[PDB]
Structure 1
Amino acid sequence: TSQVRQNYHQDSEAAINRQINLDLYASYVYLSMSYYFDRDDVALKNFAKYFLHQSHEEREHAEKLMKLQNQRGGRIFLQDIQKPDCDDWESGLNAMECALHLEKNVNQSLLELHKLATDKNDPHLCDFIETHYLNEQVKAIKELGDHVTNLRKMGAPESGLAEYLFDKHTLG
Structure 2
Amino acid sequence: SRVRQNFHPDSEAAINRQINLCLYASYVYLSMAYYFSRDDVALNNFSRYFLHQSRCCTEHAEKLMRLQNQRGGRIRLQDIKKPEQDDWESGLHAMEGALLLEKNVNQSLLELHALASDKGDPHLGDFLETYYLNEQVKSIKELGDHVHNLVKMGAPDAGLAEYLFDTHTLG
- TM-score after normalising by structure 2: 0.99
SS at match of 1:160: coil
1:69-108: per-residue Cα shift (whole Å, max 9, x none)?
0000000000000000011000000000000000000000
Residue 46 of structure 1 aligns with an amino acid whose one-letter code is N
Give the structure 1 partner of residue 56 of structure 2. 57
Give the structure 2 partner of residue 157 of structure 1. 156
Give the structure 2 partner of residue 10 of structure 1. 9
Give the structure 2 partner of residue 127 of structure 1. 126
The number of residue pairs the alignment matches comes to 171
Percent of counterpart pairs with the same letter? 81
Q: How far apart, CA to CA, are the structure 2 residues paired with 1:44 and 1:153?
A: 19
1:74 to 2:73 alignment: yes
Q: Which aligned segments of 4 or more residues in structure 1 are displaced greater than 2 angstroms?
A: none
| Shift, 1:27, TM fit | 0.3
| Shift, 1:159, TM fit | 1.0
Give the structure 2 partner of residue 107 of structure 1. 106
Q: How far apart, CA to CA, are the structure 2 residues paired with 1:132 and 1:105?
A: 17
Q: How far apart, CA to CA, are the structure 1 residues paired with 2:143 and 2:80?
A: 24
Give the structure 1 partner of residue 23 of structure 2. 24
Residue 123 of structure 1 aligns with an amino acid whose one-letter code is P
Q: How far apart, CA to CA, are the structure 1 residues paired with 2:73 and 2:136?
A: 25
Structure 2: runs of 5+ lacking an equivalent: none
1:1-59: per-residue Cα shift (whole Å, max 9, x none)?
x0000000000000000000000000000000000000000000000000001111100
Residue 72 of structure 1 aligns with an amino acid whose one-letter code is R
Q: How far apart, CA to CA, are the structure 1 residues paired with 2:74 and 2:156?
A: 45
SS at match of 1:95: helix
RMSD: 0.4
SS at match of 1:38: coil
Residue 159 of structure 1 aligns with an amino acid whose one-letter code is A
SS at match of 1:23: helix
Residue 84 of structure 1 aligns with an amino acid whose one-letter code is P
Give the structure 1 partner of residue 90 of structure 2. 91
| Shift, 1:160, TM fit | 2.5
Q: How far apart, CA to CA, are the structure 2 residues paired with 1:150 and 1:160?
A: 15
Residue 141 of structure 1 aligns with an amino acid whose one-letter code is I
Residue 110 of structure 1 aligns with an amino acid whose one-letter code is L
